[PDB]
Amino acid sequence: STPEVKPLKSLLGDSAPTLHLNKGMAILFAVVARGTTILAKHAWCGGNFLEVTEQILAKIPSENNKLTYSHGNYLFHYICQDRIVYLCITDDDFERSRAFSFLNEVKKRFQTTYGSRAQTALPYAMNSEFSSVLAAQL
Amino acid sequence: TPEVKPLKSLLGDSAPTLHLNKGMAILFAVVARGTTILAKHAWCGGNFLEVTEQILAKIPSENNKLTYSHGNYLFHYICQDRIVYLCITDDDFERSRAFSFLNEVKKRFQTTYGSRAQTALPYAMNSEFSSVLAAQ
Ligand SMILES: [Cl-]
Ligand SMILES: [Cl-]
């Protein structure tokens, strides 16, 4: 029969320590994409983020919008603006990230650095430079 | 705030898919003697070791099986022959799956490293053992 569950404070009291995962932040994955073409990406841990992300990118409209899809323990957040998609994936267990505020800062720095060259580039054409920018916003 | 919809409304009935854990939603797993960790494996980054040692310092040596809860998480452990097998999941993880995983882990660690466990240094089974912890 399954073992008891007790509060950890019953062993260590009120100073029981707290887990801070993923640097204190909820975003595991972010991409800049145009339609199904990913221009830049960054993962904060290992996961099969790409495959499902492309599935979403292929189904969503290209009109301006903002939306969150939920699945299991994750939320997939995006802003689409001028056919360009800014997307990030959050882990529901982790400490609160302001997903839309991050995507907005990402978009701004992407629109500034590249602007409408995003409209044209090959898959991954900005990955080397912009990846570390994605890692640094956060 | 943008609206939140289920992903199945966009994609249809998906199936399994996202794994910080190339499979099972276990975030961390460890084998320890008192506070000496012998082998460990993490599925993402964070302060698992510092937190886990605080718990291990206080878990007694007697045979026992138990889950502690704290915040969003569950710490499940089996202590047998003074060795603790511990894993961390979230709150929504089916607890019987944690113990069946830890029981599998204990069996192999017993078979392989007999009672060298009582004297082995920190991390002395880590290269070999982490990639069996990894494979569930
Ligand atoms: Cl915690
Ligand atoms: Cl949200």
Residue numbers in the entry:
A (entry chain B): 20 to 157
B (entry chain A): 21 to 156
What does the publication say?
VAMP7 and yeast Nyv1p (Wen et al., 2006), along with the yeast and mammalian orthologs of Sec22 (Gonzalez et al., 2001) and Ykt6 (Tochio et al., 2001), comprise the “longin” subfamily of R-SNAREs because they possess a 120–140 residue N-terminal, profilin-like, longin domain (Filippini et al., 2001) that is also found in other proteins including the σ and μ subunits of the AP2 clathrin adaptor complex (Collins et al., 2002) and the SRα subunit of the signal recognition particle receptor. We demonstrate that the clathrin-mediated endocytosis of the SNARE VAMP7 is directly mediated by Hrb, a clathrin adaptor and ArfGAP. Hrb wraps 20 residues of its unstructured C-terminal tail around the folded VAMP7 longin domain, demonstrating that unstructured regions of clathrin adaptors can select cargo.
In order to increase artificially the apparent concentration of the two components and thus make crystallizing a complex of the two more likely, a cDNA encoding the fragment of Hrb mapped as binding VAMP7 longin domain (residues 136–176) was cloned onto the 5′ end of the VAMP7 longin domain cDNA. As expected, the VAMP7 longin domain (residues 1–115) possessed a five-stranded antiparallel β sheet, flanked by helix α1 on one face with helix α2 and a truncated helix α3 on the other. The first 20 residues of the Hrb fragment (residues 136–155) are disordered, and only residues 156–176 are visible in the density. Residues 156–159 of Hrb form an additional β strand along one edge of VAMP7 longin domain strand β3. The Hrb short β strand then gives way to a single-turn α helix (residues 160–167) that is flanked by proline residues, and contacts the longin domain via hydrophobic interactions using predominantly three leucine residues. Residues 168–176 of Hrb pack against helix α1 of VAMP7 longin domain, with the interaction again being mediated by hydrophobic side chains and also one hydrogen bond between Asn24 of VAMP7 longin domain and Thr170 of Hrb.
